[PDB]
Amino acid sequence: MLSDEQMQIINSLVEAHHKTYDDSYSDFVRFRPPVRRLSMLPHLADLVSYSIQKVIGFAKMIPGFRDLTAEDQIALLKSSAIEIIMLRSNQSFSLEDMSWSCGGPDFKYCINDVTKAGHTLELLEPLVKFQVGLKKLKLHEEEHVLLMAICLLSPDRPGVQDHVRIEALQDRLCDVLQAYIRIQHPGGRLLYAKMIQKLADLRSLNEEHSKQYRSLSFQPEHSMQLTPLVLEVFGSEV
């Protein structure tokens, strides 16, 4: 059975996600419009930039994150932002469409749209297979939120200083997730291990995306289409 402090963690984590993920997607109309040359890079740059702001907002409400040093907060967000974006995007992904559908057909993204923003199938094929296998997991909101917080608070990320403290935070969160699945998820005997595998998959997607981001950001005619926030977060500064 779950403890009261374990459930407060779940509560504040669910509230943090509802405050930072807007299921109406009505904010997307103020991105630079999509074009279907890298015709999709402006719109996807704005989507990712907007998403980074929401991840930062989510992190700030993870119990204990706000108490990390600013350098550790930055270090965790610089290494994990792209992974949390891939995880959180599962909420718009459709198994039927094999795409991310954000309200309108203007904001429905195919693999092919992402190729017109500079990425290759070396990234997009593992990414779509990741989305589908994650979507088939049929996670409760509690579990999806916990996995994002676990991903964010991983200590084996370059740049972290207070390894012990953030690993203790991640331990707490993992213990919550394991208990939640056991008590509250019928037939989830294998679910915790599957979700931990997904964390491994995200590392691999992070590395490929970082490879392909370096190729973009070294071409100023493309990097100039990015936003300041994207340049800061995906950049290589320490």
Place this chain on the structure above:
Amino acid sequence: MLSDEQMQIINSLVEAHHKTYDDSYSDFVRFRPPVRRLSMLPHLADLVSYSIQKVIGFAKMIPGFRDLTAEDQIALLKSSAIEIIMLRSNQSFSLEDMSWSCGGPDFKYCINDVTKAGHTLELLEPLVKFQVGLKKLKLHEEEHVLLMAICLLSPDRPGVQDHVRIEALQDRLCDVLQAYIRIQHPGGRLLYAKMIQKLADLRSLNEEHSKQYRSLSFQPEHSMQLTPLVLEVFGSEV
């Protein structure tokens, strides 16, 4: 009477402007849309960024600019870009509307729109008075183009190294403008001196705009709405 080399300068300068100013404004639909908090800063950031690219393209076709060192090219563009944007924008300005009208009502900019991008009447009132007095000048395309090239190739700008060479280029261009007005502009006895006054006005508008840009760029929640190109060009790096 005008010489053949003087008229080749006029020719290549008019061609350079037609290649870099699109009177259809159809590119404006891919800016982040206008909102009427700094609701207009995203759209105006994209307008200015787009405009900087066109000024760079215009400069590259000024006779002699391309032969300057890259550092002198950069130095001239960093100090003059905002002035050339103010000059070139006269082509969309309407005396009847007291605004810049770029095709559609979506892309019609009031003084009030520019205040919702962070600027104050300390800038906008002199700027609008500048536009109207420039518009009343009723310049020929030849003269408008020459004034932009003269403005760009001014040597009294911080950072310039080959002062002698770019002043010789500006002398050539001024001699062209003086001859053109005398031969080709009926009743323009006083026009050359008025246009030189406008160059002085632009310095004053440059200084105020730079003051107000510093206040924006020191607030990261606003500067993050700018583009990489705007940050580079209006930035203080050398």
Place this chain on the structure above:
Amino acid sequence: KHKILHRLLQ
């Protein structure tokens, strides 16, 4: 460094 990140992290 990380001007925007610092700002957003409050």
Place this chain on the structure above:
Amino acid sequence: KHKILHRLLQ
């Protein structure tokens, strides 16, 4: 420095 400017200036 001036990465984009250099690129655009060719």
